[PDB]
């Protein structure tokens, strides 16, 4: 019985927790132990390394490799002691002896992490180590936040607490930049000329978006000065499954599409987040082999279910069987596909999909027949202790199509998914600092473009080549009205720039974007900063519509709502 991606399983369980429980205290301290550091043994760390080693065709040098694994086992034992010292100290916090135990454990944990981290980026093996690096970096930022919140009650003096907060602040950027830089270099190494190369490249991007980049996106939340109450990051990136090939050694290379052809056909260029409303699937055939030969997609954007965007036609509109319609909705998403690729018979003349079962949270719909290629394998549910309809991690977003009519015939349907944290409603609650990426807007103003994100924000970003509007973003305030919030923007800027913030009522507000970078340098962790509107706004309608006008040279990542009280 096939196992599925155990690293994806562990990662998405961790992501679920980071989204739902990112708030200081023993619950978070025990959560990391229960989900990672008291759960993963050397057996499983081996798989972490090997999953990347197989993708890049490079085994970590053996001494460095066993050094990493035993170092991770060392951190597990230390973190067990740390959690134990915290549970103890929590019950009798004034006890000077318990306070000394925690100060000892923290000092031990921090030192072990300071020395272990470089062993997770050993020269020439940084990519293969990257998913264990991100786990150690995460643990490090978490205990540095721990001391920033509790260190005084543990008995640390003011200077060392300030020193650790300065460490947290610098290392958010250092760890972020290392993960993104290493990820980009791993991707570059997998660029090649042919479709066979694209398959590996596309798998790498999926597997490391989930096991590394998705965790990096939460790193800024560990800054308690910036996020003094609970906050949740939305992962808005699209992740893609595989082309419907069984044998992925596509030979000879000359008879198959190029790398650029596949990338350009399969990966949607940057856009506002959308959600599946329906597929219309057209069945075609070659002699007696029937397959998914083309389709339309109908999508809606966040908060606005009634304005559907119809895709251009993918593939051909065959008539071998009547068109089939597959539907989803905001609260009835499709969370699982079971695909039957034609290549399950080595003799079929088309590379494509003979059938798919779609499972939604209520019922099922089958295009032609069910198959064994299971979305749960690469995108497992974020909670396995509960039914799949309750515990899924991703919702079916879109489907693209690599078409080759001549040569070996290709009907390359590929499914794309959005993570559960990117809800189809931008909800703002007075008990959270709410983060809303601007790609969750529902209109894109003319002259505004969605551009590819750097890698650490969790999704794509907005900019303009000349001053003007981004587009309207819809919000629903939950709970008893009225509510008052400070507005804050995460942005990057090549110069001192400004903008204007509007909602559907007449008071508008100027926003400033002090320079964060130089024109022409790449976006890196420190290129993004926060800017705050210090006049709070009070809202009294549940549904609200926001606009942002910006000058050029500004990149917008997200808007944030900081409750004035509660």
Residue numbers in the entry: 28 to 593
Publication excerpt:
Results from resistant insect bioassays, disabled insecticidal protein (DIP) bioassays, and cell-based assays using insect cells expressing individual receptors demonstrate that receptor utilizations of the newly modified Cry1Da_7 and Cry1B.868 proteins are distinct from each other and from those of commercially available Bt proteins such as Cry1F, Cry1A.105, Cry2Ab, and Vip3A. Taken together, these results support the conclusion that Cry1Da_7 and Cry1B.868 are effective insecticidal proteins against FAW that have the same pore-forming mode of action as other three-domain Bt proteins but bind to different receptors, suggesting that they would control resistance and increase product durability.
The Cry1Da_7 protein described here was identified by applying methods similar to those used for improving Cry51 against Lygus spp.. Cry1Da.844_8 containing the S282V, Y316S, and I368P amino acid substitutions exhibited a 50-fold improvement in activity toward CEW while maintaining toxicity toward FAW. The Cry1Da.844_8 and Cry1Da_7 proteins have 100% sequence identity in domains 1 to 3, and the full-length proteins were observed to readily undergo proteolysis using trypsin (data not shown). The resulting activated cores are comprised of the same pore-forming domain (D1) and same putative receptor biding domains (D2 and D3); correspondingly, their receptor utilizations were expected to be the same. The FAW activities of the Cry1Da_7 proteins with and without preproteolysis were comparable, suggesting that their PTX domains (domains 4 to 7) do not impact their stability or their receptor utilization in feeding assays. There was no detectable difference in insect responses between the Cry1Fa-SS and Cry1Fa-RR colonies for both Cry1Da_7 and Cry1B.868, suggesting that the Cry1F-resistant colony was not cross-resistant to either Cry1Da_7 or Cry1B.868.
